[PDB]
Design a protein around this nucleic acid. Structure first.
Ligand SMILES: [Mg+2]
Ligand SMILES: [Mg+2]
Ligand SMILES: [Mg+2]
Ligand SMILES: [Mg+2]
Ligand SMILES: [Mg+2]
Ligand SMILES: [Mg+2]
Ligand SMILES: [Mg+2]
Ligand SMILES: [Mg+2]
Ligand SMILES: [Mg+2]
Ligand SMILES: [Mg+2]
Ligand SMILES: [Mg+2]
Ligand SMILES: [Mg+2]
Ligand SMILES: [Mg+2]
Ligand SMILES: [Mg+2]
Ligand SMILES: [Mg+2]
Ligand SMILES: [Mg+2]
Ligand SMILES: [Mg+2]
Ligand SMILES: [Mg+2]
Ligand SMILES: [Mg+2]
Ligand SMILES: [Mg+2]
Ligand SMILES: [Mg+2]
Ligand SMILES: [Mg+2]
Ligand SMILES: [Mg+2]
Ligand SMILES: [Mg+2]
Ligand SMILES: [Mg+2]
Ligand SMILES: [Mg+2]
Ligand SMILES: [Mg+2]
Ligand SMILES: [Mg+2]
Ligand SMILES: [Mg+2]
Ligand SMILES: [Mg+2]
Ligand SMILES: [Mg+2]
Ligand SMILES: [Mg+2]
Ligand SMILES: [Mg+2]
Ligand SMILES: [Mg+2]
Ligand SMILES: [Mg+2]
Ligand SMILES: [Mg+2]
Ligand SMILES: [Mg+2]
Ligand SMILES: [Mg+2]
Ligand SMILES: [Mg+2]
Ligand SMILES: [Mg+2]
Ligand SMILES: [Mg+2]
Ligand SMILES: [Mg+2]
Ligand SMILES: [Mg+2]
Ligand SMILES: [Mg+2]
Ligand SMILES: [Mg+2]
Ligand SMILES: [Mg+2]
Ligand SMILES: [Mg+2]
Ligand SMILES: [Mg+2]
Ligand SMILES: [Mg+2]
Ligand SMILES: [Mg+2]
Ligand SMILES: [Mg+2]
Ligand SMILES: [Mg+2]
Ligand SMILES: [Mg+2]
Ligand SMILES: [Mg+2]
Ligand SMILES: [Mg+2]
Ligand SMILES: [Mg+2]
Ligand SMILES: [Mg+2]
Ligand SMILES: [Mg+2]
Ligand SMILES: [Mg+2]
Ligand SMILES: [Mg+2]
Ligand SMILES: [Mg+2]
Ligand SMILES: [Mg+2]
Ligand SMILES: [Mg+2]
Ligand SMILES: [Mg+2]
Ligand SMILES: [Mg+2]
Ligand SMILES: [Mg+2]
Ligand SMILES: [Mg+2]
Ligand SMILES: [Mg+2]
Ligand SMILES: [Mg+2]
Ligand SMILES: [Mg+2]
Ligand SMILES: [Mg+2]
Lengths: 156, 53, 148, 185, 222, 51
RNA sequence: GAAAUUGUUGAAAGGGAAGGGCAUUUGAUCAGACA
RNA sequence: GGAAUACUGCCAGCUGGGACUGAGGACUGCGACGUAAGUCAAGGAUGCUGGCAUAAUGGUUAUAUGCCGCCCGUCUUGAAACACGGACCAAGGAGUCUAACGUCUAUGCGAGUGUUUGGGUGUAAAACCCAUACGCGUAAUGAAAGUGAACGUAGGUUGGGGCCUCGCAAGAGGUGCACAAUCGACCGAUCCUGAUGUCUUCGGAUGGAUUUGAGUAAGAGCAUAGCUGUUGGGACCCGAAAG
RNA sequence: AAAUAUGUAAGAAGUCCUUGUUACUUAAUUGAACGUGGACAUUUGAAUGAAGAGCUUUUAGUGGGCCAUUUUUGGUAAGC
RNA sequence: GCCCUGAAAAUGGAUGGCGCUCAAGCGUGUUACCUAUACUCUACCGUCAGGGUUGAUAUGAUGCCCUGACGAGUAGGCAGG
C-alpha cells in the first residue's frame, strides 16, 4: 500500500436541517410610494426615465408604466429601492391594473396581449396626465443630475 | 467578647432566639433631619492674603 | 536510544541547553572531589558530614570470615523446618519428641530474639544466642544446644 | 490583558490513566471508571485512582498486615481489598478465613490465604460481588518504608542517612559526625 | 410509560406557578421602589417646609469600574484590585459600602471609577451583561431557572430577585453579588469627557468617586 | 448557543420577568406623581439667597 | 550530471543600492466546482 | 399670582437610516400571541429574483502604487553600530560511548531476588535448560572487646479516605489502612544503679538519665530497561605559552 | 512625637462545669501539667476574595545587571 | 504677565519638516472628531478545566459529545511531532 488507510471513516449520511424559524412577513413600502406617483428610475435599461407607479406586486416589485407612448417605457417591474419617489401624483383610480401579477411576467416578438394591455392602461393614464399641463412633457424627459445638484438636499 | 457572646446567646435562647452576634464593621449612617431652631447657617468666605511679622 | 534523547531536541538552538552566559566549559569546580575543604565545603558538611579525618582503630589484614555470623530472629526460626514437616511439629508440640533445628546447618551463627514463637517445644542447635532469644525458647519448653 | 492570579494552563497534577501499558490493567480501569461514573459509591472512585498508581505509591500489603486488619472491632468478615500485590509473611502463625481481593497474590500469599480456607479474588470479581464495594476493607501498604525516603531531607541535625556506597567506619563518621572531630552534624 | 403529556404537565403547570410567584414578587418590589423613592422626595420637601434640612443616608452600595490597564501597578492596590475582582480594564463589580471596604476603595482610587448606581443602571447591567459563576464556568443569566438553581438557597429565584437583593443590599448580598461574574463592559461609547483619564474626577479627570455621575458613564460603556 | 439581550429582544424580556407585560400595559414608566403644595420656610429661602 | 558561477534566447523593472511585510490594480499562468 | 421653558434623570414609549456577522443542523428548552385551531421575531438565516457557468470568482506569480521594514550570528546593562565572524556554493562538520551512581517510571518475581563465571543443549556467537556458590536484601549499633529489638490487641492521644450501623434526608455513632503531629515502650552506645552468686574479683540481674545511633515497633526488596542528573574517562567540538 | 511601614489576636485545636494521675510542687489532694465524665452548632462569632488546599522528590539556567519616581550617602559636578 | 536686553564657537540645518502673527504662538474654557496587538460582541485554532457517554445490530474509548476560562517571552525545562 502507498498509504495506510484511516482507522475511522466519516458517515456519508447528510443530516437534516434544524427546523429554522424565519417567517416570510409582508414588506410595507415607504410611505412615499403610493400608486399614481411619478418615479425617477435610478438604474437599469430605463435609467433616468420618469415613470408612473401602478401596483405593488407580490414579489415586492413595483408595477409601472411609462406611459409607453409618452417615453417608451412599457408596463414593467422595477425594484422599490432603485427608484426616487417624487412628490407628484396622478390619480390611478380609473386604471384596472388588477389583471397584473408575477405570473404575468413568466419569462419562459411581443405577446399581442401585452401590446394590448399596454394600450388600455396608457389610455387611462394619459386621460389623467393631460389634466395637469406640462406633466406629459415632464414624463417625456429623462432626469439627470446637473452640476450643483445635491441629492441629499433636493426635494423631488 | 466570647463570655459576652455566650451570654446574650443564652439570654436570647431562653428568650425567643433572634440574636445576630458577629461583629459587623462601621456601617454608613442613616437619613436624618437637622434643625434650625437655634441654628441658622453662618456663611463663611475665604480670606485675603496677610502677613503679621 | 539516541532517538529518545534530549540532545535531538536541542538541535537548532544555539547553546545546547547550557546557557549563553555561563556556557559549558571544561571543568569549573576543579575535577573530582577537589576543594572539599574549600569551595565545595558547603556541599560536603550536609550530605556528607563526617567525611574528613579519622576515627577508630586500624586493623591490618582483617579477614572477613573471622567475623562470619549471620543472625536469625525467633521471628523466623520456624521457617527452617520445611512447611509440610512444620505442622507435623506445630501440632504435637512436646517434650520427648520436639523438632531439632540446626541453625548453623541453615547457615546462621547467632539467634536473636525479635519476638514471639508459638508455645511449642523446639530443640535449637546454634553457635550463639542472645540472652532473650534463649529465654523465649525455654518459655515454649525448648532448649538451646550450643554447637560448632 | 488580565492581571492573572494563578498560573495559566496548569495541568491537574493527578494521573488520569495508569502510566502502565498492560491491557488487563487498562481493562480493570475500564470497568471501574464505568462503576465510578454510575454508582455514586465513593469506594469505586477511590479504586479507580489507585489503579493509576505507580509502583512506589503501591507498596505491598502483607498477609499479616491483613490478619491484623481483620482483628479490628467488627471487621473479621469484611472482605479486604488491595490495589497492589499481596505478599506472604512467615511470621504470622494463625491466619483467618476471609476474602482478599487484589491485583496480584504472590505464590506464598495466595497459598497461606487459601490454606486457611480463604479466597483470592481479582478486582473484577470483587466488582461483580460488590458493585458499591459493600462490606469492603481497603488496605494500603507502607509507602514510607521505601529505602529511598531514608535519604530525602538530608541536612545538618536532621539525622537521615548519607547517600553512601560502602559503609562502616572510615565512611563519613569523623569530622562533622562527632564532638571530637571538629563538630557534630 | 406515561409522561407523554403526563409529567410534561406536572412540570409545565408547576412552571406556571413559578412565573406566578415571580410576577407578584416583581410587582411588589416595584411598589417598594416607588414608595421608597417618593418617601425621600417628600422627606426633603417636608423638611424645607419645616425650616430644616433632610440629609439622605450615605449610600450603601457603589459600583466600581477598573479604569487603568494591567501594568505598572504597585503591590497593595494591585492586590486589592484582585480582591474586588477587577483584574482587567473596564470590567466592574458592585461593592457594599462599609468602613472595611471603604478603606479598600480608598486604596485604589487612582485606577478605578465609581459612584452610586441607579436602579436603571443595575437593571441594564444585569439584563444585558449578567452572568453567573456556576462551577466557575461563567454562565449567562438569560433564564430564571439558572438563578433559582443557585441563588435559590437564599430566596431569590429570578433575574429581578437578583437585582433587588443587589440594589437594596439585602441580608444575602455577599452571596447574591458574588454570584455575578464581574461585569465586562466596553469603552464608554462617546468617550470619557475628559482629555486625561488618570486624575481625580474633581480635577477634571476620570478616576475617583464621581457619585451619581457613575451612571452616565457605565451606560456609555454598557 | 447565542445570548439574546432582553432590553432589545422583546421575546426574552417576557421569558424573564412576567411583570413587564403589565409594566408596559400600565405605562408605569411614566407614572404621574400626585401633586402637593408644601412650600419651604422663609429661613430656607432667606439663607439660600444670603451671601 | 545539483549548486555557486557563465553564454545565448524570451519576458520585465530600474532619477544615489537591492531584497522584505499588509493590501490591491495590471499582465502572465492555473486548480476546482458546475451539469 | 399662574403658567412656560432650560437643565438633570427615568420609561419593560414609538420609530427611520447604515454597517459587520448567519456559528449550529431532526426533535427535545424557557416562553410569546390566540376563545380556540393554530401562529411566532421564543435553545444561532431564511425566502424570493437575477447573472456567469467560466479565468467570471479564486490561487499562484511578475510589476506598479499607499503605508511600513537597518545585517544576521554573538558577547553584552546596552549592537543597525565607527564591536567580532561571515565574498559565493556543495559536501563534511560538534553532549557520544563506557564504568559506578541519585531521583523517577515501566516490567518480572517477592522476604526474597539475580538463567548467560560455568555446565547442559543446539536448526550453533541465537533460542532452550541448569547444580553449587556468590552478590545485594531480610538487624541494628560501638573506636572496639561486644551486645542485639513486644509491659501493652506491637501502646496512648489528635486529624484521617474508605467501610460498617441508625436515619426518608440531614445528620449521628462504630471502625479506622496510608500519611501527618505528639507522648511513650524496645535494641545498641554513653553515664548511673550494682540483687542472687562468686576460682576475692570475677559476675552484671535489676531499675534509672536535659545524652546518643544511617535502628525496632506484622518486612520491601532484588533484577532488567528508559529519560534526566552525577563522577572518572580525549568526555560537546576546535585552541596555548609550555613540559 | 507623627505619616508610611511592623508583632499578635478575631473560637470546635472553642468557652465553661464535674474531679482522676504523678516520683514534680504546696503548710496542705495545695498547685502544675495530661486526662475521664457533662453543658452550648453554624450570625460557630469581622470584611473581601479563593479556576481549591496541603505535601514530597528531583533537576536546568542564573549567581557582570541596568533604568524611572520617591527616600538617600560621597562628590562643585557628571549620561559619575 | 507676555515681550525685549542681559545671550560668545567652530561643515549648512533644524518647534520633526513646510510654514504660521485677531496663529498654525502663550494661558484657560467648551464641543466634535482621528486611531493600539488594549476594551466589547462574534467566528476559527490551540491549552487547561469541569460534565456526559461501552448499549449492541458498523468504522478511532489514547475516542465521541457538552460547557467555561486562558494565549508575551531570552536562559532554561518539558511535551507532541
Ligand atoms: Mg416557525
Ligand atoms: Mg416592513
Ligand atoms: Mg418620447
Ligand atoms: Mg544513556
Ligand atoms: Mg534511537
Ligand atoms: Mg525524535
Ligand atoms: Mg527543547
Ligand atoms: Mg521548543
Ligand atoms: Mg529544533
Ligand atoms: Mg530557547
Ligand atoms: Mg541543561
Ligand atoms: Mg555560546
Ligand atoms: Mg578520605
Ligand atoms: Mg527479621
Ligand atoms: Mg529496613
Ligand atoms: Mg503613571
Ligand atoms: Mg465585591
Ligand atoms: Mg451614546
Ligand atoms: Mg452623539
Ligand atoms: Mg464616534
Ligand atoms: Mg492631550
Ligand atoms: Mg454599548
Ligand atoms: Mg556526463
Ligand atoms: Mg517576467
Ligand atoms: Mg501580493
Ligand atoms: Mg447556517
Ligand atoms: Mg450553519
Ligand atoms: Mg477552469
Ligand atoms: Mg466571463
Ligand atoms: Mg515582489
Ligand atoms: Mg521607513
Ligand atoms: Mg561575540
Ligand atoms: Mg561593554
Ligand atoms: Mg546584532
Ligand atoms: Mg557608532
Ligand atoms: Mg572578540
Ligand atoms: Mg571579516
Ligand atoms: Mg556564512
Ligand atoms: Mg550537510
Ligand atoms: Mg558458534
Ligand atoms: Mg533442554
Ligand atoms: Mg556442580
Ligand atoms: Mg552482606
Ligand atoms: Mg563485656
Ligand atoms: Mg558487629
Ligand atoms: Mg497521652
Ligand atoms: Mg466519625
Ligand atoms: Mg475512637
Ligand atoms: Mg535505650
Ligand atoms: Mg555515644
Ligand atoms: Mg545502615
Ligand atoms: Mg542497609
Ligand atoms: Mg564529565
Ligand atoms: Mg591541542
Ligand atoms: Mg603544545
Ligand atoms: Mg610543543
Ligand atoms: Mg613544569
Ligand atoms: Mg498589618
Ligand atoms: Mg467567594
Ligand atoms: Mg474551586
Ligand atoms: Mg534548583
Ligand atoms: Mg549555582
Ligand atoms: Mg559570569
Ligand atoms: Mg517606571
Ligand atoms: Mg528653540
Ligand atoms: Mg506641526
Ligand atoms: Mg490654546
Ligand atoms: Mg465640529
Ligand atoms: Mg486582534
Ligand atoms: Mg507561549
Ligand atoms: Mg506565560
Amino acid at each position: 500500500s502507498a498509504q495506510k488507510a484511516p482507522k475511522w471513516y466519516p458517515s456519508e449520511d447528510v443530516a437534516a436541517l434544524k427546523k429554522t424559524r424565519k417567517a416570510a412577513r409582508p414588506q410595507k413600502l415607504r410611505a412615499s410610494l403610493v400608486p399614481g406617483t411619478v418615479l425617477i428610475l435610478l438604474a437599469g435599461r430605463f435609467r433616468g426615465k420618469r415613470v408612473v407607479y401602478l401596483k405593488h406586486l407580490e414579489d415586492n416589485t413595483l408595477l409601472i408604466s411609462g406611459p409607453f407612448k409618452v417615453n417608451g417605457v412599457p408596463l414593467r417591474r422595477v425594484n422599490a429601492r432603485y427608484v426616487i419617489a417624487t412628490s407628484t401624483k396622478v390619480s390611478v383610480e380609473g386604471v384596472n391594473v388588477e389583471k397584473f401579477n408575477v405570473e404575468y411576467f413568466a419569462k419562459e416578438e411581443i405577446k399581442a396581449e401585452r401590446v394590448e394591455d399596454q394600450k388600455v392602461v396608457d389610455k387611462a393614464l394619459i386621460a389623467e396626465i393631460k389634466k395637469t399641463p406640462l406633466l406629459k412633457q415632464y414624463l417625456s424627459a429623462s432626469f439627470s443630475l446637473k452640476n450643483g445638484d445635491k441629492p441629499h438636499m433636493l426635494k423631488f | 467578647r466570647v463570655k459576652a457572646n455566650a451570654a446574650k446567646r443564652a439570654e436570647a435562647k431562653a428568650q425567643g432566639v433572634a440574636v445576630q452576634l458577629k461583629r459587623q464593621p462601621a456601617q454608613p449612617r442613616e437619613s436624618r433631619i437637622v434643625s434650625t431652631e437655634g441654628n441658622v447657617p453662618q456663611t463663611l468666605a475665604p480670606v485675603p492674603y496677610e502677613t503679621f511679622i | 536510544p539516541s532517538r529518545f534523547t534530549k540532545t535531538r531536541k536541542h538541535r537548532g538552538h544555539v547553546s545546547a541547553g547550557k546557557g549563553r552566559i555561563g556556557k559549558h566549559r571544561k571543568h569549573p569546580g576543579g575535577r573530582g572531589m577537589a576543594g572539599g575543604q574549600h569551595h565545595h565545603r558547603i556541599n560536603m558538611d550536609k550530605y556528607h558530614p563526617g567525611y574528613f579525618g579519622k576515627v577508630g582503630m586500624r586493623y591490618f589484614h582483617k579477614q572477613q570470615a573471622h567475623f562470619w555470623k549471620p543472625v536469625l530472629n525467633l521471628d523466623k526460626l520456624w521457617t527452617l523446618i520445611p512447611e509440610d514437616k512444620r505442622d507435623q511439629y506445630l501440632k504435637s508440640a512436646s517434650k520427648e519428641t520436639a523438632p531439632v533445628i540446626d541453625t548453623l546447618a541453615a547457615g546462621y551463627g547467632k539467634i536473636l530474639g525479635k519476638g514471639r514463637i508459638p508455645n511449642v517445644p523446639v530443640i535449637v542447635k546454634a553457635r550463639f544466642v542472645s540472652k532473650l532469644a534463649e529465654e523465649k525458647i525455654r518459655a515454649a519448653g525448648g532448649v538451646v544446644e550450643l554447637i560448632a | 490583558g488580565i492581571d492573572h492570579t494563578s498560573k495559566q494552563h496548569k495541568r491537574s497534577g493527578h494521573r488520569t490513566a495508569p502510566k502502565s501499558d498492560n491491557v488487563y490493567l487498562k481493562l480493570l480501569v475500564k470497568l471501574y471508571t464505568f462503576l465510578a461514573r454510575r454508582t455514586d459509591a465513593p469506594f469505586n472512585k477511590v479504586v479507580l485512582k489507585a489503579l493509576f498508581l505507580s509502583k512506589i505509591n503501591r507498596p505491598p500489603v502483607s498477609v499479616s498486615r491483613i490478619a491484623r486488619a481483620l482483628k479490628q472491632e467488627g471487621a473479621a468478615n469484611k472482605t479486604v481489598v488491595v490495589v497492589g500485590t499481596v505478599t506472604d509473611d512467615a511470621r504470622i502463625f494463625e491466619f483467618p478465613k476471609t476474602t482478599v481481593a487484589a491485583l496480584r497474590f504472590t505464590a506464598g500469599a495466595r497459598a497461606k490465604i487459601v490454606k486457611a480456607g480463604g479466597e483470592c479474588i481479582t478486582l473484577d470479581q470483587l466488582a461483580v460481588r460488590a458493585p458499591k464495594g459493600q462490606n469492603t476493607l481497603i488496605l494500603r501498604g507502607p509507602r514510607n518504608s521505601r529505602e529511598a525516603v531514608r535519604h530525602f531531607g538530608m541536612g545538618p541535625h536532621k539525622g537521615k542517612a548519607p547517600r553512601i556506597l560502602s559503609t562502616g567506619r572510615k565512611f563519613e563518621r569523623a569530622r562533622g559526625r562527632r564532638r571530637s572531630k571538629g563538630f557534630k552534624v | 410509560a406515561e409522561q407523554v403529556a403526563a409529567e410534561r404537565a406536572a412540570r409545565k403547570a408547576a412552571n406556571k406557578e413559578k412565573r406566578a410567584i415571580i410576577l407578584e414578587r416583581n410587582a411588589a418590589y416595584q411598589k417598594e421602589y416607588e414608595t421608597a423613592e417618593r418617601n425621600i422626595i417628600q422627606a426633603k420637601r417636608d423638611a424645607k417646609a419645616a425650616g430644616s434640612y433632610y440629609v439622605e443616608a450615605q449610600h450603601k452600595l457603589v459600583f466600581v469600574v477598573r479604569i487603568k490597564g494591567i501594568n505598572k501597578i504597585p503591590p497593595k492596590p494591585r492586590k486589592v484590585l484582585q480582591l474586588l475582582r477587577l483584574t482587567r480594564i473596564n470590567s466592574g463589580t458592585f461593592v457594599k459600602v462599609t468602613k472595611a471596604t471603604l478603606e479598600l476603595l480608598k486604596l485604589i482610587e487612582p485606577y478605578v471609577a465609581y459612584g452610586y448606581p441607579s436602579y436603571s443602571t443595575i437593571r441594564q447591567l444585569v439584563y444585558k451583561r449578567g452572568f453567573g459563576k456556576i462551577n466557575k464556568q461563567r454562565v449567562p443569566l438569560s433564564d430564571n431557572a439558572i438563578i433559582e438553581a443557585n441563588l435559590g438557597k437564599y430566596g431569590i429565584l429570578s433575574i429581578d430577585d437578583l437585582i433587588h437583593e443587589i440594589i437594596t443590599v439585602g441580608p444575602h448580598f455577599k452571596q447574591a453579588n458574588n454570584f455575578l461574574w464581574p461585569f465586562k463592559l466596553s469603552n464608554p461609547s462617546g468617550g470619557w469627557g475628559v482629555p486625561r483619564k488618570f486624575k481625580h474626577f474633581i480635577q477634571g479627570g476620570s478616576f475617583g468617586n464621581r457619585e451619581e455621575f457613575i451612571n452616565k458613564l457605565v451606560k456609555s460603556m454598557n | 448557543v447565542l445570548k439574546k439581550n432582553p432590553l432589545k429582544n422583546k421575546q426574552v424580556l417576557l421569558r424573564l420577568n412576567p411583570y413587564a407585560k403589565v409594566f408596559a400595559a400600565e405605562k408605569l414608566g411614566s407614572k404621574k406623581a400626585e401633586k402637593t403644595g408644601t412650600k419651604p420656610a422663609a429661613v430656607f429661602t432667606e439663607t439660600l439667597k444670603h451671601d
